[PDB]
UniProtKB/Swiss-Prot annotation, chain A:
Residues 71-88 are annotated as: Disordered. Component of a hexameric 5S RNP precursor complex, composed of 5S RNA, RRS1, RPF2, RPL5, RPL11A/RPL11B and SYO1; this complex acts as a precursor for ribosome assembly. It comes from the Eukaryota. It is found in: Nucleus. Required for ribosome biogenesis. The gene is RRS1. The chain holds residues 103 to 201 of 203 of the full protein. Belongs to the RRS1 family. The lineage of its organism: Eukaryota, Fungi, Dikarya, Ascomycota, Saccharomycotina. Disruption phenotype: Depletion causes defects in processing of pre- rRNA and assembly of ribosomal subunits. This is Regulator of ribosome biosynthesis.
Swiss-Prot record, chain B:
Component of the large ribosomal subunit (LSU). Mature yeast ribosomes consist of a small (40S) and a large (60S) subunit. The 40S small subunit contains 1 molecule of ribosomal RNA (18S rRNA) and 33 different proteins (encoded by 57 genes). The large 60S subunit contains 3 rRNA molecules (25S, 5.8S and 5S rRNA) and 46 different proteins (encoded by 81 genes). One of its GO terms (cellular component) is cytosolic large ribosomal subunit. This is Large ribosomal subunit protein eL21A. One of its GO terms (molecular function) is structural constituent of ribosome.
């Protein structure tokens, strides 16, 4: 087979090189959840991002549905960006 | 239970994410996922548009006493028409004699043993 050395900057590496944005250290999923005695990592299992859905009062249509729609919109935007980068 | 707009419910919780337990409000909106309750709060009094799931909400019996008293007063007036319906605070107890024949006063001796 030919060499798999395909290259593409995805439009992000170009900006990261233009700016002084160093790559994130990529520490881990764990993040401290204040007001509680548990870590509940940012993502991976029982993520804190899902906390807003399981909590009891959402002061200020159900706002939980709005948050879920926002999550779906962000995921679809990421997928669209991936498709755009694949087009190149 | 089928909650309806305008009903009075008590915000009872089953970690916190807030401290509103024990407060009562009136339902202003209802949906499948949650029930909307409005709670008044002082700055003049402001208002908060709370939204809570049915799991942490229950009906309030605050107005049960009012309706029961109204019905009892109406019935009493109807019966007496054939009135002093006003509620009265607990009046001071009157004098009463106590007999020690069946119970000798015992010096409890707070030692006690």
């Amino acid at each position: 087979k030919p060499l798999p050395k395909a290259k593409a900057m995805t439009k992000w590496e170009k900006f990261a090189a233009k700016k002084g944005i160093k790559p994130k250290e990529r520490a881990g999923k764990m993040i401290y959840d204040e007001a509680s005695g548990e870590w509940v990592p940012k993502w991976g299992y029982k993520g804190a991002n899902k906390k807003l859905d399981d909590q009891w009062l959402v002061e200020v249509i159900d706002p939980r549905t709005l948050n879920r729609a926002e999550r779906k919109r962000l995921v679809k935007k990421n997928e669209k960006q991936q498709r755009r980068n694949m087009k190149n | 239970k089928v909650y309806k707009v305008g009903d009075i419910v008590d915000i009872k919780a089953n970690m916190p994410h807030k401290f509103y337990q024990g407060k009562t409000g009136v339902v202003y909106n209802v949906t499948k996922s949650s029930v909307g309750v409005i709670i008044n709060k002082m700055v003049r009094y402001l208002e908060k548009r709370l939204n809570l799931r049915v799991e942490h909400i229950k009906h309030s019996k605050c107005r049960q006493e009012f309706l029961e008293r109204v019905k009892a007063n109406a019935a009493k007036r109807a019966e007496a028409k054939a009135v002093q319906l006003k509620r009265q605070p607990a009046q001071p107890r009157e004098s009463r004699i106590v007999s020690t024949e069946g119970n000798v006063p015992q010096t409890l001796a707070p030692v006690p043993y």
